[PDB]
Amino acid sequence: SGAIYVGNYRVVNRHLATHNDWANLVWEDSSRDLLVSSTTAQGCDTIARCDCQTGVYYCSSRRKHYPVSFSKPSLIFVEASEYYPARYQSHLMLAVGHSEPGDCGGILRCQHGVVGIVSTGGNGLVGFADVRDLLWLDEE
Ligand SMILES: NC(=O)[C@H]1CCCN(C(=O)C2(c3ccoc3)CCC2)C1
Numbered sequence: 001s002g003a004i005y006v007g008n009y010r011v012v013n014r015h016l017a018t019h020n021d022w023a024n025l026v027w028e029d030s031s032r033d034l035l036v037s038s039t040t041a042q043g044c045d046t047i048a049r050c051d052c053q054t055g056v057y058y059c060s061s062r063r064k065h066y067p068v069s070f071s072k073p074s075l076i077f078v079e080a081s082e083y084y085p086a087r088y089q090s091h092l093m094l095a096v097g098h099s100e101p102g103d104c105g106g107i108l109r110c111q112h113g114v115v116g117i118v119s120t121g122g123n124g125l126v127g128f129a130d131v132r133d134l135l136w137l138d139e140e
């Protein structure tokens, strides 16, 4: 579980979005596993605007933050799960690390701010849904 809180926006994994999120929808993309809903109160997360490939992510299944090197956002095959059929997920970055069901929503951060959130796992890899291209998160 986990979310990003920036301005009047809440960014969560689309597959974990609640009834309150769909009832206050701003934007969603199934191919990216992202959903953004509106909030009443202003958030304090800063979204990174950079091309960093090293950062630190939170792993809830270990109660630990791990420093990782991660790949550039790309179209990557993700196996079928209870949430999506087998498909290419876009804007996804991989790192070598631990990610289990329950870890989605953990933040990945670099020196510039929030880079993305955990979206995939297994086989000793962790995948993060990038949010650095969503420039509109910083305005209105
Ligand atoms: N974005 C997606 O399509 C993911 C939806 C949730 C399940 N996905 C995973 O990668 C798995 C996982 C392991 C750790 O966290 C998640 C489930 C076993 C691997 C795929």
Ligand SMILES: [Zn+2]
Residues within 6 Å of the ligand: 048, 049, 050, 051, 052, 110, 111, 112, 113
């Ligand atoms: Zn950065």
